[PDB]
């Protein structure tokens, strides 16, 4: 009775959400039509949260997969868990194509399949009673995912205005422009939906992904299948309080309520240390709880680009540090002692900040009983660099003349572009003003 419905949308948004459902079945110990482990009731104690309980011995997703490009869902229709989702209830057989590397393609296919885009989630609710919310698993990258996802940020926030809306938004590569050229336009239209048509959001820079993907994995080649893994793992990690046992902190609307201080400061920095196969040679000094929040405050796990002086001329107010897996965490108060002396995480000087530490176990399974997981979910007011990154790549594309009339023929014939800039400077001045 705290059911979240994932709205996977987009060519990259179906794919970064794919490895999120595939992560969840391997710890639930289930087969996509049967049970092959007892980890289905022993690891997973609260089994309805994104899953729906058995009716044929299998837990059926609470997922909807609508996308303009049918190529990605057909890359889900064959997989050895392609029957993990329903073959005709979670995605249509095919979808109509778009132009469709533009924001207004997907924005217009939602105003003719409008009856069905608001019904394919009402058929997913069938074991719920009271609804928790909606997660939009969409990617800003391409025109498909950015396109239907900006529409649904408004309507599910004015038909469910007390439920969570939250997208795990992930930006495309910004050091190439021919990889998606509509990138400065479709981002700032979306960034409007994140600050006054959204409750809380997760934005993750792309150059900070490929920073970990060639460091921690110790290779010299960033390919896009070492990036859909960093994403799926921190998503499945955050709902470990709404699945595995724990008292204080257990709602997903509990975590996020502590991490919003203002309706446009709510952009959360994510870090997740373990991505390495060296937690078995690091057990020779003991795996202990006396290092598992020193590695979540130290900047070497960051997934958001920001400068290296904006981390002492701005302030964290709320940082959530969830350690996972049996580790002896009754020294967790010894650990939190040693943060204040260094002042590793900055604090707000007008009052107290809060460093919330929680714990939760995980399934009796091999990467969650020898391998420890630490999720940091910060809320730092150093996020104003991302909006400056987007505004400086916005005015240069208007100096390139692109999208001053080549955007304005797929159903926009009104000027509304500076409107997204002005609301954005309202955000960027209130971020710096919020910490004193």
């Amino acid at each position: 009775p705290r059911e979240i419905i994932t709205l996977q949308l987009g060519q990259c948004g179906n794919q970064i959400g794919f490895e999120f459902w595939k992560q969840l079945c391997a710890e639930h110990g289930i087969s996509p039509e049967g049970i092959v482990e007892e980890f289905a009731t022993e690891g997973t104690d609260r089994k309805d949260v994104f899953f729906y309980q058995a009716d044929d011995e299998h837990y059926i997703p609470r997922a909807v997969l609508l996308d303009l490009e049918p190529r990605v869902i057909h890359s889900i229709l064959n997989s050895p868990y392609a029957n993990l989702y329903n073959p005709e209830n979670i995605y249509l057989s095919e979808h109509g194509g778009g132009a469709g590397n533009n924001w207004a393609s997907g924005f217009s296919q939602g105003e003719k399949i409008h009856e069905d885009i608001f019904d394919i989630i009402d058929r997913e609710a069938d074991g719920s009673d009271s609804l928790e919310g909606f997660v939009l698993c969409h990617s800003i990258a391409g025109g498909t995912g950015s396109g239907l996802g900006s529409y649904l940020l408004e309507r599910l926030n004015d038909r469910y205005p007390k439920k969570l809306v939250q997208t795990y938004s992930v930006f495309p590569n910004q050091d190439e422009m021919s990889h998606v050229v509509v990138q400065p336009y479709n981002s700032l239209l979306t960034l409007k939906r994140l600050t006054q048509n959204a409750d809380c959001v997760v934005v993750l820079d792309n150059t900070a992904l490929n920073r970990i993907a060639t460091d921690r994995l110790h290779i010299q080649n960033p390919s896009f299948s070492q990036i859909n893994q960093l994403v799926s793992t921190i998503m499945s990690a955050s709902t470990t309080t709404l699945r595995y046992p724990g008292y204080m902190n257990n709602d997903l609307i509990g975590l996020i309520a502590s991490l919003i201080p203002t309706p446009r400061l709510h952009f959360l920095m994510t870090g997740y240390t373990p991505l390495t196969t060296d937690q078995s040679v690091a057990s020779v000094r003991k795996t202990t709880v006396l290092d598992v929040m020193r590695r979540l405050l130290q900047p070497k796990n960051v997934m958001v680009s920001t400068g290296r002086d904006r981390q002492t001329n701005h302030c964290y107010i709320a940082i959530l540090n969830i350690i996972q897996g049996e580790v002896d965490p009754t020294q967790v108060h010894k650990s939190l002692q040693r943060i204040r002396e260094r002042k590793l995480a900055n604090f707000i000087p007008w009052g107290p900040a809060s460093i919330q530490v929680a714990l939760s176990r995980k399934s009796p399974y091999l990467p969650s009983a020898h391998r420890v997981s630490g999720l940091m979910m910060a809320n730092h007011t150093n996020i104003s660099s991302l909006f400056e990154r987007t505004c400086r790549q916005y005015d240069k594309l208007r100096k390139r003349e692109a999208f001053l009339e080549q955007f304005r023929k797929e159903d926009i014939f009104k000027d509304n572009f500076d409107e997204l800039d002005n609301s954005r400077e309202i955000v960027q001045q209130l971020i710096d003003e919020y910490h004193a």
Partner: protein, 128 residues
């Protein structure tokens, strides 16, 4: 005599499993002379065996070497993370919560500077 029964008293404090001789208790002579050698084979037995117990399984040599490296700074390579980082935190007038914020910095620096067995070397507390 007095210092044999003393040490058969300090083995009760490390538990009875190393009190009582394992073949003496067969002696009891009626000679005068020769009962002073009975004292002596008492005297070497009960004093050595309390040393065996405490060198073996309470590790007296591994504790005494460690007392040596903190109170003489023998391995000082630890102390360039210990001393440096306490001396900044005591520069203002000392309060009752100042030695607490040092011992937070000590066990902070203990595992950065990674001594042999940090769960064994955490015994230290700071008093000012």
């Amino acid at each position: 005599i007095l210092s044999t029964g003393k040490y058969l008293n300090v083995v009760r404090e490390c538990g009875h499993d190393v009190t009582c001789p394992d073949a003496k208790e067969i002696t009891y002579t009626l000679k005068e002379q020769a009962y002073v050698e009975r004292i002596e084979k008492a005297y070497n037995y009960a004093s050595k065996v309390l040393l065996d117990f405490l060198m073996e399984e309470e590790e007296l040599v591994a504790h005494l070497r460690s007392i040596k490296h903190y109170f003489l700074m023998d391995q000082g390579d630890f102390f360039v993370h210990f001393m440096d980082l306490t001396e900044e935190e005591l520069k203002k007038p000392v309060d009752d919560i100042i030695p607490t914020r040092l011992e937070a910095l000590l066990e902070l620096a203990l595992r950065m500077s990674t001594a042999n067995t940090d769960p064994f070397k955490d015994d230290l507390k700071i008093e000012l």
